[PDB]
Design a protein around this ligand. Structure first.
Ligand SMILES: [Cl-]
Ligand SMILES: [Cl-]
Ligand SMILES: [Cl-]
Ligand SMILES: [Cl-]
Ligand SMILES: [Cl-]
Ligand SMILES: [Cl-]
Ligand SMILES: [Cl-]
Ligand SMILES: [Cl-]
Ligand code: NA
Length: 129
């Protein structure tokens, strides 16, 4: 599923991401925009052989199992395929664990490089929430 901007904002808020660990909803929408362009089916291989999955490009090196990332962990206790669902529940639950890991949203390099410090409220501008 390819979400619209406000549609995703609404789903993320519904699933309790809004202000989770102090990160306003616009941060999460901005991260999703640059990680996946709002596409739940997005997958991208990393140079190290891990793969990133879903709207928030969660990495198989630490967080999900894809059966082909040697030496990795599965700290969200899910198959990475679960992270590609049209229903964002698995991605949200796993993102809550990631963002609680110590470095906040810096875990998402695109968030650090493209969202952090910017006017992230623009991402939820005009949305019925
Ligand atoms: Cl957009
Ligand atoms: Cl915001
Ligand atoms: Cl593996
Ligand atoms: Cl393969
Ligand atoms: Cl594990
Ligand atoms: Cl699995
Ligand atoms: Cl959903
Ligand atoms: Cl933080
Ligand atoms: Na893994």
């Amino acid at each position: 599923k390819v979400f619209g901007r406000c549609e995703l904002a609404a789903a993320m808020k519904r699933h309790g991401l809004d202000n989770y660990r102090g990160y306003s909803l616009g941060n999460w929408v901005c991260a999703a925009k640059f990680e996946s362009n709002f596409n739940t089916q997005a997958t991208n291989r990393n140079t190290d052989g891990s793969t990133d999955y879903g709207i928030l490009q969660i990495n198989s090196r630490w967080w999900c199992n894809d059966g082909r990332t040697p030496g990795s962990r599965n700290l969200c206790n899910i198959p990475c395929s679960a992270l590609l669902s049209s229903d964002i529940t698995a991605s949200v639950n796993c993102a809550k664990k990631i963002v609680s890991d110590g470095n906040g949203m810096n875990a998402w390099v695109a968030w650090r490089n493209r969202c952090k410090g910017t006017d992230v409220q623009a991402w939820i501008r005009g949305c019925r929430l």
